[PDB]
Design a protein around this ligand. Structure first.
Ligand code: MG
Length: 81
RNA sequence: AAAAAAAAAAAAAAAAAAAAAAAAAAAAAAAAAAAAAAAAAAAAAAAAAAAAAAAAAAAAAAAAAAA
């Protein structure tokens, strides 16, 4: 009940996701720059966990999630630059 | 008066019993009767009778990270 892993709430196909593209899609793509700020990492993970909380209160996040999953696999889940 | 040594080396010696035609009995139904080395000489291991062997146990992984 305490591991609370935002990679696991949005996991797909045993592909342990790289949260750079997750923050580029689900929020502003400010986590696509660089410099590897850990405080930025935890803060964006906080924001994505809040996004999980909001759209799990909406409880329909798998629909648009799988739509943008297929859409980003047309992108092949790469880094948009 | 058939009157013989009275036992080495743990010697050595007894049996502890039969066709019965006694009386007017034919010619193997036995179940098989069945010997040869020795010129430096004969030589299975696995565990040993298939009187009934269906014999691919699904797979799919689009991929990571971890800024
Ligand atoms: Mg990652």
């Amino acid at each position: 009940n305490q591991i609370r892993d935002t990679a696991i709430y949005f996991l797909q196909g045993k592909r342990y996701l790289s949260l750079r593209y997750l923050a580029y899609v689900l929020l502003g793509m400010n986590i696509q720059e660089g410099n590897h700020d850990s405080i930025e990492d935890a803060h964006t993970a906080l924001i994505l966990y809040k996004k999980y909380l909001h759209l799990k209160e909406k409880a329909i996040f798998e629909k648009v999630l799988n739509s943008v999953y297929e859409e980003g696999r047309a992108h092949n889940f790469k880094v948009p630059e």
